[PDB]
RNA sequence: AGGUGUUGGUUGAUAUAGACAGCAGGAUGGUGGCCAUGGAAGUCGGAAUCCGCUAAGGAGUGUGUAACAACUCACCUGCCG
């Protein structure tokens, strides 16, 4: 049946200041600004209390299928707040069997010249997402640090260079090659 | 010729997946049913034959 | 150099179904002589496979009779020497002598890995029902007979 | 079943608390069943070690508050892994014997190590194995006359360092048990008086 | 270096396994890179070498001497000491100047291996310079290494030039 | 044939003496219980399926070994409820 009320309060800190207008909020803090629209889910927001200490969300008279979509938006908001305050640092390494994968960055952290992928003369130019700053760091064999604000953009920039290495219609059990994500965390320590 | 930890990391994403019987869909190995309409959510699964 | 190894020999009949080659191979002494010495030292067992310990010295190994659970029970249930072809259902059943039970439990107390004679008698009679027998009754009767009526030393 | 066993545990705790008004509180961390049996080989009958659910301990102490008021401060001392040791022999000897009878064993790959892993300068005493498991971790191994000897005593796992899976195989190959796992005493209860 | 050390160790395991003559019936039949048994080279271009040529070469540059070529003497003992110190964990760094037994630096820094720095590092530099075609590097490189070129190989560059330089440098 | 698609009944219990999650620790000695088998210990077969010992460890759930070795689980403990 239609459950009348299922609230979920969010205890935002003082450094994260928001100001809602309908279903569009703005998030500021130490670094990075992120905006996202919330017109599609059609819920009610309530920013209560003096000096804006906590947020409240409502979903009036929704069934079992519609109440399941309420908790995940809170997780997306918490991931956005974590990306504004701390950030997202994705570290990942390269795996090769015989032919090494020549990885170098071009156009100030927005293009990767992938060369010599398992003896193939074809090259790839996987462009990064806008906002994500790739950096090939030192003291390792292959180490590409990805840094940015939004979790969707950073994970998409990770997924493009992760699944760019595809072997077309061969034995993936024997051919074990590809660049994959190993480490995930934040930019600054909490 | 290859690092064993990075080899198992490559096994985690690609190879270690359950395979459906009817439609042979690639599924995560913590599933009870399939995720395809073409099979009809077949509960019967099989582990992928690993390399020896 | 002291090495301890187990040999599960048949003892009584000629056991061809065995694989004891890598044990005393690179040492130099023949394993057939060791198996014949174990089969001679058994003598009255004649039916069972016993993991006999070998205290291997510098010259030759020594013979130590290992008290097993089921093997001493089927030894107490005495039998004539049977055929070499080894027909199935060789497990015997009858009346085990309580003095023989005490004589086995004294060797178990010399082994010393249980309660003061009570856990030893109970762990012998627990294997006795797994083999299949009765000492004037089965193991639920033996638990009653051990409490306040058995010769607890 | 379990419903009779839960009620029998109340009879066990009331019998032990009526028999022995003196106890030791211990904590068992990562101990094996064979290690606990080797502890009971010494402390078989004179020291009874009892364990159970902490809420059932709390209900048992709330029940014993009506009978004996001397069992008062046992409620805030139940923290973490609490185990009772019922004995009426001595207070100063058993606290040394529990430190003495710790059983040595190897460390598991995944848990933290309490002590430092040290490899003494001694040959393996076997055939020549590979050096990929030893030289990759940091210990330099010079090969001289078949058996591989260790020259530099390089400590791999420190106090609090995470034990890896590749470095756990070399300890099993060398058959070295430097650690000493066992229970740690936390509180001492001596006739209505908790000392530490 | 560790890969070829594991290869030499596997060959030594094979010798110790199937050795019917163990240390005196046959002799010291174990493979040793110090004596000059392990041969490094590639016959596709033509260059191949042992340790004895570099043990003879580097003692003239650092630091003494010519001079008394005959005979089985201090010069040969210095060449044998050089080929002994090239193999093994004997680190070297030009900021220290002299030799060092410890793996760590006295100042608290990393010490490179001498088999890396003296041998494989200029080989990597000459392969890098020839494959990247840098004339300002290779002119002073030929002037340093004394490469005798008196033909059209000055104009001919690339893989035949690399093959000619390697065959002239290490027969 | 069905489908953790969704809406509704019945039975069976665990439960503030703290069940369901979720994260860790052992997962024992007699014993390698016996017959047979080239090996049966837990891993080709057939009957037993019990004790000392607890809080608990199955004559051992599964992966893997020629038999072992290695790893994992039910039953049992520490944290939250």
Curated annotation (Swiss-Prot), chain A:
N6-acetyllysine PTM positions: 121
Keywords: Acetylation, Cytoplasm, Ribonucleoprotein, Ribosomal protein
InterPro entries the UniProt entry points to: Ribosomal_uL6-like, Ribosomal_uL6-like_a/b-dom_sf, Ribosomal_uL6_a/b-dom, Ribosomal_uL6_CS2
Gene3D superfamilies cross-referenced by the UniProt entry: Ribosomal protein L6, alpha-beta domain
Parts of the chain that traverse the membrane: none
Compartment annotation: Cytoplasm
GO BP, sorted A to Z: cytoplasmic translation
Keyword Cytoplasm: yes
SUPFAM superfamilies from the UniProt entry: Ribosomal protein L6 (SSF56053)
Gene Ontology MF term list: rRNA binding; structural constituent of ribosome
PROSITE patterns in UniProt: RIBOSOMAL_L6_2
Coiled-coil portions: none
Annotated Gene Ontology cellular component terms: cytosolic large ribosomal subunit
Assembly, per entry: Component of the large ribosomal subunit.
Purpose of the protein: Component of the large ribosomal subunit. The ribosome is a large ribonucleoprotein complex responsible for the synthesis of proteins in the cell.
Family according to the record: Belongs to the universal ribosomal protein uL6 family.
Protein name: Large ribosomal subunit protein uL6
Biological source species: Oryctolagus cuniculus (Rabbit)
Lineage: Eukaryota, Metazoa, Chordata, Craniata, Vertebrata
The gene coding this protein: RPL9
From Swiss-Prot, chain C:
Pfam families tied to this protein: Ribosomal_L11, Ribosomal_L11_N
GO MF terms held by the record: large ribosomal subunit rRNA binding; structural constituent of ribosome
Gene3D superfamilies: Ribosomal protein L11, C-terminal domain (1.10.10.250), Ribosomal protein L11/L12, N-terminal domain (3.30.1550.10)
HAMAP family in the cross-refs: Ribosomal_uL11
Phosphoserine: residues bearing it: 30
Family: Belongs to the universal ribosomal protein uL11 family.
InterPro entries: Ribosomal_uL11, Ribosomal_uL11_C, Ribosomal_uL11_C_sf, Ribosomal_uL11_CS, Ribosomal_uL11_N, Ribosomal_uL11_N_sf
Alphabetically ordered keywords of this record: Acetylation, Cytoplasm, Isopeptide bond, Phosphoprotein, Ribonucleoprotein, Ribosomal protein, RNA-binding, Ubl conjugation
Modification N6-acetyllysine occurs at: 46
Crosslink (Glycyl lysine isopeptide (Lys-Gly) (interchain with G-Cter in ubiquitin)) position: 40, 75
BP GO annotations: translation
Function: Component of the large ribosomal subunit. The ribosome is a large ribonucleoprotein complex responsible for the synthesis of proteins in the cell. Binds directly to 26S ribosomal RNA.
Taxonomic lineage from the root: Eukaryota, Metazoa, Chordata, Craniata, Vertebrata
Protein name: Large ribosomal subunit protein uL11
Disulfide bonding pattern of the chain: none
GO cellular component: cytosolic large ribosomal subunit
Positions of crosslink type Glycyl lysine isopeptide (Lys-Gly) (interchain with G-Cter in SUMO2): 32
Main location as per UniProt: cytoplasm
From Swiss-Prot, chain E:
Modified residues (N6-succinyllysine): 98
Residue positions where Phosphotyrosine is found in the record: 91
Location in chain, cross-link Glycyl lysine isopeptide (Lys-Gly) (interchain with G-Cter in SUMO): 148
Residues that bear N6-acetyllysine: 61, 65, 98, 101
Residues bearing PTM Phosphoserine: 151
Coiled coil start-end: none
Transmembrane segments annotated in the record for this chain: none
Residue numbers binding GTP: 42-44
Domain of life according to the entry: Eukaryota
Signal peptide bounds: none
Localization: Cytoplasm; Nucleus
Cross-link (Glycyl lysine isopeptide (Lys-Gly) (interchain with G-Cter in SUMO1)): 65
Post-translational modification: Phosphorylation by CSK promotes SUMOylation, proteolytic cleavage, and nuclear translocation if the C-terminal fragment. Diphthamide is 2-[3-carboxyamido-3-(trimethyl-ammonio)propyl]histidine.
Quaternary structure and interacting proteins, as annotated: Binds to 80S ribosomes. Actively translating ribosomes show mutually exclusive binding of eIF5a (EIF5A or EIF5A2) and EEF2/eEF2. Interacts with SERBP1; interaction sequesters EEF2/eEF2 at the A-site of the ribosome, thereby blocking the interaction sites of the mRNA-tRNA complex, promoting ribosome stabilization and hibernation. Interacts with HABP4; interaction takes place at the A-site of hibernating ribosomes and promotes ribosome stabilization. Component of the mRNA surveillance SURF complex, at least composed of ERF1, ERF3 (ERF3A or ERF3B), EEF2, UPF1/RENT1, SMG1, SMG8 and SMG9.
Similarity field: Belongs to the TRAFAC class translation factor GTPase superfamily. Classic translation factor GTPase family. EF-G/EF-2 subfamily.
Disease: Spinocerebellar ataxia 26: A form of spinocerebellar ataxia, a clinically and genetically heterogeneous group of cerebellar disorders. Patients show progressive incoordination of gait and often poor coordination of hands, speech and eye movements, due to degeneration of the cerebellum with variable involvement of the brainstem and spinal cord.
Name listed for the protein in its UniProt record: Elongation factor 2
Source species: Homo sapiens
Gene: EEF2
């Amino acid at each position: 049946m239609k459950t009348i009320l299922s609230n979920q309060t969010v205890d935002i800190p003082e450094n994260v200041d928001i100001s809602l207008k309908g279903r569009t909020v703005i998030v500021k803090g130490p670094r990075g600004t992120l905006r996202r629209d919330f017109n599609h889910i059609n819920v009610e927001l309530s920013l209560l209390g003096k000096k804006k200490k906590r947020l409240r969300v409502d979903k009036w008279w929704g069934n079992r299928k519609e109440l399941a979509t309420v908790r995940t938006i809170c997780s997306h908001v918490q991931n956005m707040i974590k990306g504004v305050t701390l950030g997202f640092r994705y570290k990942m390494r390269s795996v090769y069997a015989h032919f090494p994968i020549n990885v170098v960055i071009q156009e100030n952290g927005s293009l990767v010249e992938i060369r010599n992928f398992l003896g193939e003369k074809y090259i790839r130019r996987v462009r990064m997402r806008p906002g994500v700053a790739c950096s090939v760091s030192q003291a390792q064999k292959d180490e590409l640090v990805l840094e940015g604000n939004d979790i969707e953009l950073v994970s998409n920039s990770a997924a493009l260079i992760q699944q760019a290495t595809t072997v077309k219609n061969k034995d993936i059990r024997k051919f074990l090659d590809g660049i994959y994500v190993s480490e995930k965390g934040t930019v600054q320590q909490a | 010729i290859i690092e064993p930890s990075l080899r198992q990391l490559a096994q985690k994403y690609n190879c270690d997946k359950m395979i459906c019987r009817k439609c042979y869909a690639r599924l995560h190995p913590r599933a009870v049913n399939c995720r395809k309409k073409k099979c009809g959510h077949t509960n019967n699964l099989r582990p992928k034959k690993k390399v020896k | 150099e002291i090495k301890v190894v187990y040999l599960r020999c048949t003892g009584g009949e000629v056991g061809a179904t065995s694989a004891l080659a890598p044990k005393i191979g690179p040492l130099g002494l023949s394993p057939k002589k060791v198996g014949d010495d174990i089969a001679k030292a058994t003598g009255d067992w004649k039916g069972l496979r016993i993991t006999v310990k070998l205290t291997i010295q510098n010259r030759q190994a020594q013979i130590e009779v290992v008290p097993s659970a089921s093997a001493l029970i089927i030894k107490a249930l005495k039998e004539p020497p049977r055929d070499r072809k080894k027909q199935k259902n060789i497990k015997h059943s009858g009346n085990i002598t309580f003095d023989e039970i005490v004589n086995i439990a004294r060797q178990m107390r010399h082994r010393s890995l249980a309660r003061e004679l009570s856990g030893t008698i109970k762990e012998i009679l627990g294997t006795a029902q797994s083999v299949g027998c009765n000492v004037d009754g089965r193991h639920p009767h033996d638990i009653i007979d051990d409490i306040n009526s058995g010769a607890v030393e | 079943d379990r419903a009779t066993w839960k009620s029998n545990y109340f009879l066990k705790i009331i019998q032990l608390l009526d028999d022995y008004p003196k106890c030791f509180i211990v904590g068992a961390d990562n101990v094996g069943s064979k290690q606990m049996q080797q502890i009971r080989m010494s402390l078989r009958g004179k020291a009874v070690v009892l364990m159970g659910k902490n809420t059932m301990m709390r209900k048992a102490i709330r029940g014993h508050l009506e009978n004996n008021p001397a069992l008062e401060k046992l409620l805030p001392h139940i923290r973490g892994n609490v185990g009772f040791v019922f004995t009426k022999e001595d207070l100063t000897e058993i606290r040394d014997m529990l430190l003495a009878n710790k059983v040595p064993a190897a460390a598991r790959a995944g848990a933290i190590a309490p002590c430092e892993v040290t490899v003494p300068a001694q040959n393996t005493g076997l055939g020549p194995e590979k050096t990929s498991f030893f030289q990759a971790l940091g210990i330099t191994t010079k090969i001289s006359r078949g058996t591989i000897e260790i020259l530099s005593d390089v400590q791999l796992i420190k106090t609090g360092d995470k034990v890896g899976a590749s470095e756990a195989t070399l300890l099993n190959m060398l058959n070295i048990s430097p650690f000493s796992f066992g229970l740690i005493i936390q509180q001492v209860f001596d006739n209505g008086s908790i000392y530490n | 270096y560790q890969t070829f050390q594991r290869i030499v160790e596997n060959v030594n395991v094979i010798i110790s396994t199937y050795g019917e003559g163990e240390s005196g019936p046959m002799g010291n039949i174990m493979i040793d890179p110090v004596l000059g048994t392990v041969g490094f080279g590639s016959g596709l271009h033509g260059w191949a070498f042992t340790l004895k040529q570099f043990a003879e070469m580097y003692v003239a540059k650092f630091a003494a001497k010519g001079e008394g070529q005959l005979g089985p003497a201090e010069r040969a003992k210095k060449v044998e000491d050089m080929m002994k110190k090239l193999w093994g964990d004997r680190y070297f760094d030009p900021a220290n100047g002299k030799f060092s037994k410890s793996a760590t630096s006295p100042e608290g820094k990393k010490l490179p291996r001498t088999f890396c720095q003296l041998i494989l590092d200029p080989i990597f530099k000459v392969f890098d310079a020839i494959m990247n075609f840098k004339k300002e590097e290779t002119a002073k490189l030929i002037e340093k290494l004394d490469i005798k070129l008196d033909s059209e190989d000055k104009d001919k560059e690339g893989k035949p030039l690399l093959k000619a330089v390697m065959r002239r440098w290490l027969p």
